Design a protein around this ligand. Structure first.
Ligand SMILES: [Ca+2]
Ligand SMILES: [Ca+2]
Length: 290
DNA sequence: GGGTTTCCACTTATTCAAGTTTTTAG
DNA sequence: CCTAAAAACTTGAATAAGTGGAAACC
């Protein structure tokens, strides 16, 4: 195939990517711990194709199943991490994950110098892991009773190719059949993301010249939606972005279906029985209906 | 060698994606 | 009346993040 666009790749990595650092107890390591560093992406078997395109683009990474319904692309070959670092130095992440990427660079530096085989090297990898993703494990915390200070990432959307990658991961295209003819057809575009990235989400309103932001939460967990319902905004500002900047994954299929329906709203055909039928058949075979 | 690296099978907590309603704007 | 648009919510699983186990390279 062809190279995945560098900016779509970072956009997909902001959404679905993950950086990893394993500090494991090992009775056979000079320092009692062995380490593994890398970057990984896990998807439904559905989108194995994405993983395989990212692999031939980077010429690194190993693909294996993850449970019965998922598939992962992991990169931990030390030398192959140079490729991941050459990418994100050129096409930096945008979300708070850039923080996890920076603590990923510092660990790579520790391991490039081979320090992680000496006592003080593992201590530094522990200070770093404390701030990366979910931080230290309890077994590991009680083993290392550390330093911190992680900066908040506050960047803006660099270009549209980034949005396509992010949306391919976090995007959502929905046809809302609203009761009451008694069935209003309303298109909906959604981006969902943890409240940790309030500032990025709010920039979608100005960046896309439409939409609105609301917060929901289940128990202690909160998140934000970016929602677009105005048809003219969807037909003129949202749809043209992703025609220009193609999406990846089966979600690409969902969008194309969304657009089929969009062209019916435009032609006013959804106000007729025969047209509302075709809209109903299109909703059936998209999203979880696919 | 054999410590260390790299890989393959697998698990889990929640952040997502997706869906369900009812109200408000025009 | 007549839709369009917005408000507000819930929910399960595809994520992200992590873990077990070991062949075997260097
Ligand atoms: Ca995400
Ligand atoms: Ca996704």
């Amino acid at each position: 195939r062809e190279s995945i666009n560098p900016w779509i790749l970072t956009g997909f990595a902001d959404a679905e990517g993950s950086f990893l650092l394993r500090i494991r107890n090992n009775n056979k390591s000079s320092v009692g711990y062995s380490t593994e560093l890398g970057f990984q992406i896990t998807l439904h078997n559905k989108d194995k194709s994405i993983l395989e395109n990212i692999q031939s683009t980077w010429k690194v990474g190993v693909i294996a199943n993850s449970g019965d319904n998922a598939v992962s692309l992991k990169v931990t070959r030390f030398e192959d991490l140079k490729v991941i670092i050459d990418h994100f130095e050129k096409y930096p992440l945008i979300t708070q994950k850039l923080g996890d990427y920076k603590l990923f660079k510092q660990a790579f530096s520790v391991m490039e110098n081979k320090e992680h085989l000496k006592e003080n090297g593992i201590k530094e990898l522990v200070r770093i892991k404390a701030k990366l993703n979910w931080g230290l494990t309890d077994e590991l915390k009680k083993a290392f009773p550390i330093s911190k200070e992680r900066s908040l990432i506050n960047k803006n959307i660099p270009n549209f190719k980034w949005l396509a990658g992010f949306t391919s991961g976090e995007g959502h295209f929905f046809v809302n059949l609203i009761k009451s003819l008694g069935v209003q057809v309303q298109l909906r575009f959604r981006i969902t993301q943890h409240i940790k990235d309030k500032n990025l989400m709010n920039s979608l309103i100005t960046y896309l010249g439409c939409g609105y932001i609301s917060e929901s939460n289940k128990s202690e967990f909160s998140w934000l939606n970016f929602t677009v319902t105005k048809f003219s905004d969807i037909n003129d500002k949202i749809i043209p972005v992703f025609q220009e900047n193609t999406l990846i994954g089966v979600k690409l299929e969902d969008f194309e279906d969304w657009c089929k329906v969009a062209k019916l709203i435009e032609e006013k055909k959804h106000l007729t029985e025969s047209g509302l039928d075709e809209i109903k058949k299109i909703k059936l075979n998209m999203n979880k209906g696919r």
